[PDB]
Amino acid sequence: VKDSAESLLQDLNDFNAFLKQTAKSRTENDVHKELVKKIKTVVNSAEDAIDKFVIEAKLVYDVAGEIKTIRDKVKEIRLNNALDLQALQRKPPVVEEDDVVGFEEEADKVINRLLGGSSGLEVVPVVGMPGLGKTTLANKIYKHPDIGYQFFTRIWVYVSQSYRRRELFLNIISKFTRNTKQYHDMCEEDLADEIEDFLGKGGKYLIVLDDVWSPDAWERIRIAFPNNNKSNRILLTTRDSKVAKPHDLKFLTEDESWILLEKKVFHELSGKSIAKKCNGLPLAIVVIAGALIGKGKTSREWKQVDCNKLVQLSYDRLSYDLKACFLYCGAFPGGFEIPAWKLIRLWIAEGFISLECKAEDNLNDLINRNLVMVMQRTSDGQIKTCRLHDMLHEFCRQEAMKEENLFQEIFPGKRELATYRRLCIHSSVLEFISTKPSGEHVRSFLSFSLKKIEMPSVDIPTIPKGFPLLRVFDVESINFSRFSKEFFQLYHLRYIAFSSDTIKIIPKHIGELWNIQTLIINTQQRSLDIQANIWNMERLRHLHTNSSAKLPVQSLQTLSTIAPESCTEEVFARTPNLKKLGIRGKIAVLVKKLESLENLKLINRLPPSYIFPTKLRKLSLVDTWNDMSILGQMEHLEVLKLKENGFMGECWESVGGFCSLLVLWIERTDLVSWKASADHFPRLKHLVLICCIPIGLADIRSFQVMELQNSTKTAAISARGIRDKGFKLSIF
Amino acid sequence: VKDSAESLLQDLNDFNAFLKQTAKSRTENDVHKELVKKIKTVVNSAEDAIDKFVIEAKLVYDVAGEIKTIRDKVKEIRLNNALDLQALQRKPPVVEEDDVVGFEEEADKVINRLLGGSSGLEVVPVVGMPGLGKTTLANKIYKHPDIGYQFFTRIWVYVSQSYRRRELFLNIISKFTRNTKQYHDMCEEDLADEIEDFLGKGGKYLIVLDDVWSPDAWERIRIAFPNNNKSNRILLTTRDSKVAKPHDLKFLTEDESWILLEKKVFHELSGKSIAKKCNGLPLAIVVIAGALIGKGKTSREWKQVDCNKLVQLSYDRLSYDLKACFLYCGAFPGGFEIPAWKLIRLWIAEGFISLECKAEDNLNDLINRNLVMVMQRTSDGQIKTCRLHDMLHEFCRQEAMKEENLFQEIFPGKRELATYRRLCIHSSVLEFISTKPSGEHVRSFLSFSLKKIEMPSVDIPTIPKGFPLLRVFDVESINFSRFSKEFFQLYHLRYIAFSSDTIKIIPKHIGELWNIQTLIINTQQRSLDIQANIWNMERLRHLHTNSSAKLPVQSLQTLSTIAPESCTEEVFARTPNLKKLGIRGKIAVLVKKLESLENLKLINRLPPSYIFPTKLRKLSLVDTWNDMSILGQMEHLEVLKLKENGFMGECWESVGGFCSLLVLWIERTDLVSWKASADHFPRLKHLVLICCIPIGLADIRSFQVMELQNSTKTAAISARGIRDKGFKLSIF
Ligand SMILES: Nc1ncnc2c1ncn2[C@@H]1O[C@H](COP(=O)(O)OP(=O)(O)OP(=O)(O)O)[C@@H](O)[C@H]1O
Ligand SMILES: Nc1ncnc2c1ncn2[C@@H]1O[C@H](COP(=O)(O)OP(=O)(O)OP(=O)(O)O)[C@@H](O)[C@H]1O
């Protein structure tokens, strides 16, 4: 059976290489698409069989039969479709010029940015979502009367993914001379020099480089534009934020969306609801208006209404792994606030992806390409939450549900569920669960709902029974009263995330699951006792709990909210690579050996400063004023968060030197008198005071962002005075 | 089984020919890459099976089974992937013009070289590493105000690997006339004559020939440039040193590297450490700055950071054997000082490559292409040590570890080690050894560490056990207390290099290994007794020991530090091809028959000069003044090194005539009075005096390099006076 496993592994590797090769091009051939789907199904079957054999080897007849039948299927596919297997390995946009809604103020903003500045060649980059309207705004600015009056020469160059520098340079030359047959033998650099002479002969010039996709194209084309100490400007529209390094183009409002839809259809509650569902994207409004123009003007045909090639331009530029990472963001429901940490852990568990660094790099790559929107950011600048735009969400859902079978949103029949690979259900979870589903190839069970669900006791073991091959089990919105004997049979589990109301103890049978990477226990009990062999899990990396978990007496990276009785030297000696640590166990009971620790959280007198780790970067104290001199000696502390009565006192005088502090966060304190000088916070950048101000922080060079919340008006006056003395101040 | 061995040899030969053919082109097809990897794996398996059969034949059932299964695998591969097997058989650079750091002095140097010289057409060649900045410096010089003022005509020609002479000539012509349609029927020689007329009509001309790759291109393009007795100049940038036969472009300093990185990212300790790790290569700085511009400006995302197509241009021009020789240099750790002799012997033993002459030619070819950097050179001009640049080291490591599986740096599992071919481990050697690794296909075990390691006795036979197919065993950084019975079972050994502290005797069972080529015994004992049948090793070529080895009573080329009791006529009659010989055995105890000897070393009254070999070229005496008249009669001696009290005396008067001496090396002597004239050293070029001067050596025509070290200031004054009377003098 082992040699059969090796042969099946070789077949699966060749099929995976074929799938990776065919993903480089989109095929419209239906036979090729069907063959690709068949090959993907066989690949999934082979993966499941190999994982089953691996689990049995770690711990057989049915496994052998499955391996034989999958090998036979592979041979049949190779023999039958050999020829198909071998065969499977410029229009500038027309934008609106007459009825442009909402861009009247953004156009003036960009124009005033173009008409003002230094005397050098400056660039005004416009970045935005696919179909946001960057070309429309660039055209409105390009044909504006003020721009035409100020700029003697205006040139519109349409760059794209595919362009020829010689063709572009000869197109630019034709705007100045008609005898372009004299350049048939000059090189592209001589063409650029000729363009430089042409542009320098006149006055100021404005150049619109539309749809720049890489900095390489920008550098190659820029050699034709002189910098002759005149206020020459370049207007650049791009999807990627890297090419702009800007002006982030706005979204249309609800009223503007309705205005655009009404103008496009008619040169109504149903119409207003249709325009509201486009989320301020003019491309969606245009597409839906083109669809509505063909239907009759009847309220019943507009209630039935309640593109794809433009998005594919940026989706086809993603790598093979980044495409699967991007499509997995469509599993989260529409408008959902995706937690970045949860998304990263899910990506690592699904096998798409230190691994955390690569996953954060993938998320930042998706954000830079404007495929993912950021809303919440951490105080230190990291991303906290994100979401997909509704058109991007629809694209991801359609692609991953139809063409890739990455996941299926849920009722499917017994024949349909046998082909599903991942399940995402957030509505009518109990109704689907009561049907007793059974999927032998389902690898993930996702349930992202913000409403808590209590799982009936009679239905407790249905998911571990019907889906025994689960690798990801994210049911943190479902309360599990108890664990059945079938949960411990999920030997393939890598990501487990459950919520509970009465689970005060983790059984030792959890340690029988040696594939666990992330163990998230969201319980409302005050204390939790983890009896499972945490240290015997060789693949465990993160352990998140919201209670005071008590660990039993290398790859581990996070130990969130453990009890201080579990802060022994023996326990900390088993986790040399720990980076984030939290304690929520009556701090008064009590980490030096953790030389890689960066995040520390204590939730409820400070010891000498030499006891705390010297490499700590972020420290947060919750429910625990002159004691801050101990935290001042921390030479590497950069973020300090005080939440929920973290530091209580009346008078605080700044004495210690926070040589590395960048963010100071104080929440729910009784501080009355605070005296400080610029010397005590040399590197301060971020200051947040919520539900709580010496004028010495205006002398700080790095102080640029200050956040204020509800408090006495004297604090608001002090903040306003500090702002008067770019600074960002917000008071609420 | 013999006929099966012949059939498998034929199959392996065909597969090797296929692998050699596909290496001529880089394939981006993933299916093709997987097929190439599979074919390489099968080739390795066939090679191991054939060598096992050869060893058994020299000295069976398992060998037959392995041969049958490998033949079946070959047939299956041939039948399955026949179509894939059959299918498997211009952008000038844009460089920085505004922010160029560090080149302000190099540009002035090259400019003063261009503006000064004779009245003929001179060339200023700029040679350097891939990405060093030759094009940037050439562009800075080309657009310099002084160059523009002095040279009326300046032409920038971009040569590359692929160029068309007609296209280049028509591009040059277009710089002088716009009616280039009159040249549609002239030959390229008439085009060159027209260019000659155009360039001779004006004044002086400067021409920048960028990226010249072969002297043939230089000769073909040079026919268009007249030599009209004006100070016409050509600026040439190339990677190969042969095309320049120059100006070796400098590397950016650490401060300059940080300046460039800061300028590129921001138009920090982490930033300084990132710029320091680029090793002064502006291409690496540019790439890392482009990478950093996409990440957020947070200290945590800059600590996570702690191209390839440019290097591939020079790597793809290497031959099939030179590519493997080059990638093997990446086995040595980063920044390691690779000994040239050890590298050559390793290349010969690995089968990449008299053989020593070819290996030295390969090393010099790699050096000329600027793929390998030379730091230490022998006193006679030969190369002693070398290293790889860190970008080249990374390229070699990545290529040989991912795409070729040439070697793997080390923990890998039992399934992963079954595919490894060579192992390089220099950190945590004992930890990996204690895991008891077992690789049935591992052919080399490399450990290049400068820190000595004592090998536990319980772990002594682990390497000969887990790796029974070893061909190269370089563990000279590991001390072996004793030899286990498994060491003598390594019948495939070709290169054995071990260190020891108490091994005073080599067992006779070493002679059972008849495949040994290099036998390096690095022991700290004063004397060593080699009982193995050295003369029975028909393939032994080099025998290096640091102790007084006592040999027992044709291919041999080196016998380093043997005892003079082993300098008998009988022993020397068995080695007619010996070229290097050393003796470290109390020289007072005592080679004429060695008619091919070149190097002789005696380590502790001279006999008549007719006793010493007449062919001797280099002689070194260690611990052994009027006796130098005996060495003077040596008509072919060119290098004479005196180290560690080699020649002791008070007064030395030069009498003998060193008609062929080129290098004189004196170290740690008590010489007080030295009298000499130009007649006694007619051919002297190199003079080194360390830890020890008549003015008669200034009359020597060939005296150009003099090296001095710590001594009395009178010697420094004499050296300075000699320099006053190009000469290279260094005093420390
Ligand atoms: N403010 C607007 N008013 C009216 N129509 C608009 C407006 N903005 C965009 N459109 C229209 O919606 C579509 C959006 O395409 P457009 O070229 O403006 O987008 P883009 O930002 O350049 O996107 P892409 O990245 O795909 O090039 C076009 O048909 C355009 O005419
Ligand atoms: N001194 C410098 N200051 C700033 N940027 C530099 C400097 N030297 C090189 N660069 C930049 O680094 C890269 C090096 O490429 P460059 O063309 O200068 O190298 P090269 O010596 O011609 O190499 P190749 O053999 O690959 O052609 C370019 O992007 C160039 O702009």
Residue numbers in the entry:
A (entry chain A), B (entry chain B): 27 to 85, 103 to 132, 144 to 299, 308 to 329, 338 to 376, 392 to 438, 445 to 501, 509 to 651, ...
Show sentences the authors wrote.
NRCs are essential helper NLR (nucleotide-binding domain and leucine-rich repeat) proteins that execute immune responses triggered by sensor NLRs. Asterids—the largest group of flowering plants—have a complex immune receptor network composed of a multitude of sensor CC-NLRs that can signal redundantly via downstream helper MADA-type CC-NLRs, the NRCs (NLRs required for cell death). The N. benthamiana helper CC-NLR NbNRC2 exists as a homodimer at resting state and assembles into a higher-order oligomeric resistosome upon activation by Rx or other NRC-dependent sensor NLRs. NLRs typically exhibit a tripartite domain architecture consisting of an N-terminal signaling domain, a central nucleotide-binding (NB) and oligomerization module, and C-terminal superstructure-forming repeats.
We show that perception of the Potato virus X coat protein (PVX CP) by Rx triggers the formation of homohexameric NbNRC2 resistosomes, distinct from the previously reported pentameric assemblies formed by singleton CC-NLRs. We used an NbNRC2 variant with mutations in its N-terminal MADA motif (NbNRC2EEE), which was previously identified to abolish cell death induction without compromising receptor activation and oligomerization. The Rx-activated NbNRC2 oligomer contains six protomers that are assembled into a star-shaped resistosome. The α1 helices (residues 1 to 26), which carry the MADA consensus sequence, were not resolved in the NbNRC2 homohexamer, indicating their flexible nature. In the reconstruction, density was observed within the groove formed between the NB domain and HD1 domain of each protomer that is well modeled by a molecule of adenosine triphosphate (ATP). The ATP phosphate groups are coordinated by NB domain residues T189, T190, K188, and R293, and the adenine base is within a hydrophobic pocket bordered by F156 and V356. The most extensive interaction that stabilizes the central part of the resistosome is formed by the embedding of each HD1 domain within a concave surface of the adjacent protomer lined by the NB, WHD, and LRR regions. At the interface between NB domains, aspartate D239 and cysteine C241 from one protomer contact threonine T234 and asparagine N225 at distances of 3.3 and 4.4 Å, respectively, in the other protomer. By contrast, the two modules must undergo a rotation of approximately 180° with respect to each other to transition between the states. The α4 helix of NbNRC2 contains a bend near residue L126, which is at the end closest to the resistosome core.
